[PDB]
C-alpha cells in the first residue's frame, strides 16, 4: 500500500505534535519514494533536523531545504533534481502535499503543505500526498508565518520516518 510517513515538529524548541502524510506512490511512485527515503534518512541525508523556512498564512507551509535551510537548496535521492513525474493529482484543498520547485523539472527535496485550495499551482507543482493526521499541527505552523514567508518562530522537523 501507499507509504505513511511522519514529521514531528517543534516551534522554538517546544513540540507541536506529529503530521502524518500519505504518499500517493500509486500515482507518483518516483516522487513518493524520494520523500519516503528523505523521511527515513536511509540514504544518509534527509529531513531530520531541517526547518519550515517559508510559511505564508492562508497559503502554505514550505520545508525541506536540508542543505541551505533557506529555500535555495535541498537534493533528491536520485541526484540534485528530478523531473516532474505527472500533474494528475490536484491542489484541491488544505492538507495537500506538493513539491516546491524553481520551474519545470526542478524537484529536489523542498515541499509544501497547503492550507487552502491552491488551484493556480495545478500543472506546475507535482502533488504527491496529503495529511492523514495532524492538520492542527499544520495550522499551528501556519500561524507562525507572515505575508513575506518569514517565520516568527523557529520551526524544526525534529524527527521523521516511515510508519508503514
Ligand atoms: C522562491 C522561493 C523558493 C524557491 O522557489 N526556491 C527554488 C527551489 C525550489 C525547490 C528546489 N528543489 C530547488 C530550488 C524557496 N523558499 C522561498 C522563500 C521565499 O520567500 N521565497 N522562496
Amino acid at each position: 500500500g501507499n507509504p505513511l510517513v511522519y514529521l514531528d515538529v517543534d516551534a522554538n524548541g517546544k513540540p507541536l505534535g506529529r503530521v502524518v502524510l500519505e504518499l500517493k506512490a500509486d500515482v507518483v511512485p518516483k516522487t513518493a519514494e524520494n520523500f519516503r527515503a528523505l523521511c527515513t534518512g536511509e540514504k544518509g541525508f534527509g529531513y531530520k533536523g531541517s526547518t519550515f523556512h517559508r510559511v505564508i498564512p492562508s497559503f502554505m507551509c514550505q520545508a525541506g531545504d536540508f542543505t541551505n535551510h533557506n529555500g535555495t537548496g535541498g537534493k533528491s535521492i536520485y541526484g540534485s533534481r528530478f523531473p516532474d513525474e505527472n500533474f494528475t493529482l490536484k491542489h484541491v484543498g488544505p492538507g495537500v502535499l506538493s513539491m516546491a520547485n524553481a520551474g519545470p523539472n526542478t524537484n529536489g527535496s523542498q515541499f509544501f503543505i497547503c492550507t487552502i485550495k491552491t488551484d493556480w499551482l495545478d500543472g506546475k507543482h507535482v502533488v504527491f500526498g496529503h495529511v492523514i493526521e495532524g492538520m492542527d499541527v499544520v495550522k499551528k505552523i501556519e500561524s507562525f508565518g507572515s505575508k513575506s514567508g518569514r517565520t516568527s518562530k523557529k520551526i524544526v522537523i525534529t524527527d521523521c520516518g516511515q510508519l508503514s
Side-chain angles (χ1 to χ4, degrees), residues 65-105:
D65 181 358
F66 59 80
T67 65
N68 297 343
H69 309 287
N70 65 15
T72 64
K75 59 180 177 180
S76 84
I77 65 170
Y78 309 116
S80 67
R81 303 290 181 258
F82 68 104
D84 296 318
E85 188 165 16
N86 61 61
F87 299 111
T88 303
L89 288 160
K90 307 302 180 181
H91 297 82
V92 292
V96 163
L97 176 66
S98 184
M99 289 302 285
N101 67 49
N105 304 302

Side-chain angles (χ1 to χ4, degrees), residues 53-54 62 70-73 81 100-102 106-110 148-149:
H53 72 274
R54 178 203 190 189
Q62 180 169 338
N70 65 15
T72 64
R81 303 290 181 258
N101 67 49
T106 61
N107 302 288
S109 54
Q110 288 184 59
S148 72

Side-chain angles (χ1 to χ4, degrees), residues 105-117:
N105 304 302
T106 61
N107 302 288
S109 54
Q110 288 184 59
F111 64 95
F112 60 102
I113 301 171
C114 299
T115 60
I116 62 159
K117 179 176 176 190

